[PDB]
Amino acid sequence: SLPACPEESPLLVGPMLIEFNMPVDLELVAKQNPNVKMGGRYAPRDCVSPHKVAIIIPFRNRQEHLKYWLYYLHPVLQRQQLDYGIYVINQAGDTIFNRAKLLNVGFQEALKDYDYTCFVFSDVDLIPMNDHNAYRCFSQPRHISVAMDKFGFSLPYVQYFGGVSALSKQQFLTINGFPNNYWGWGGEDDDIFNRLVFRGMSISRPNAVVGTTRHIRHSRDKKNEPNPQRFDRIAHTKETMLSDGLNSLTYQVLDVQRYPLYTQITVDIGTPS
Ligand SMILES: CC(=O)N[C@H]1[C@H](O[C@H]2[C@@H](O)[C@@H](CO)O[C@@H](OCc3ccc4ccccc4c3)[C@@H]2O)O[C@H](CO)[C@@H](O)[C@@H]1O
Ligand SMILES: NCCCCCCOP(=O)(O)OP(=O)(O)OC[C@H]1O[C@@H](n2ccc(=O)[nH]c2=O)[C@H](O)[C@@H]1O
Ligand SMILES: [Mn+2]
Fold this sequence. Notes:
This protein has 273 residues and is of the alpha/beta class. The protein has helices at 26-32, 63-79, 99-113, 169-174, 188-198, 230-234, 237-240; strands at 41-42, 52-59, 83-91, 118-122, 126-128, 142-143, 147-148, 164-168, 212-215, 252-258, 263-268. Strand 10 and strand 11 form a beta hairpin.
């Protein structure tokens, strides 16, 4: 009987103040966000959202950033009137990090929970400064974190597609998902950009003011060193995407934790083959 939510949420307040210098207590954040259900799920109670969104976070040893992420995003996602769920894909073990393979795991595993039709892929340390920056999907792949403080509030280059993005289920399937062999830092987001272009799509973005985003300043994590093969890998995306991605993926889930504000999937994604 519920009518459809309006096209744009009337609850949005625009520009918000973001700070990362205070402690965060997730028990309290949960109290502040009473309508968020076990596992970090929420749907509005007064209308039906056409946006069934799984928010995927690549993760390992960033609990503090995550706390900030949950404190700021949860209120924003409810104001955006989304039918959403949060998934932190925690990489088991201590070997070289693989951001994009975790993202692929996230897509596959969240689909087992619910009929999601949109996927937001977000680094754990990026917080939006304006709730008008929609964390849902569009008719074309959506780049969300378009104006980051660390890049001077502008794109570092015009084809930059890293940070936070949103792909509908169909867009993600059309590019065979993300590459599984970008181990260590860099390039996997450029590869993904290439995949979208090679499948006839173009990047949708909000304007630079609405797209303003804060990056929690942090130092280098061990086990995610710049991948030296990244420039050669992005040069062959058209050929490699055909057989590297969803259709060449395996992983072993070790544990699934339903916390009040998010579901954490700990997974073994292995090492280079
Ligand atoms: C592959 C890679 O390392 N990508 C990461 C990206 O790296 C940037 C950065 O190094 C920058 C400053 O030196 O230069 C970029 O390259 C310039 C450029 C971009 C795209 C082109 C496409 C066709 C022809 C010529 C081009 C020139 C380089 O890609 O930095 C991002 C932000 O830190 C990372 O997310 C990304 O993984
Ligand atoms: N001068 C300090 C510069 C330090 C450069 C470190 C690289 O910085 P960025 O380009 O922001 O990449 P990154 O923050 O390491 O993370 C990319 C994303 O991977 C995730 N990530 C990466 C590495 C790691 O050990 N754990 C983790 O969770 C996380 O969601 C993160 O936001
Ligand atoms: Mn970062």
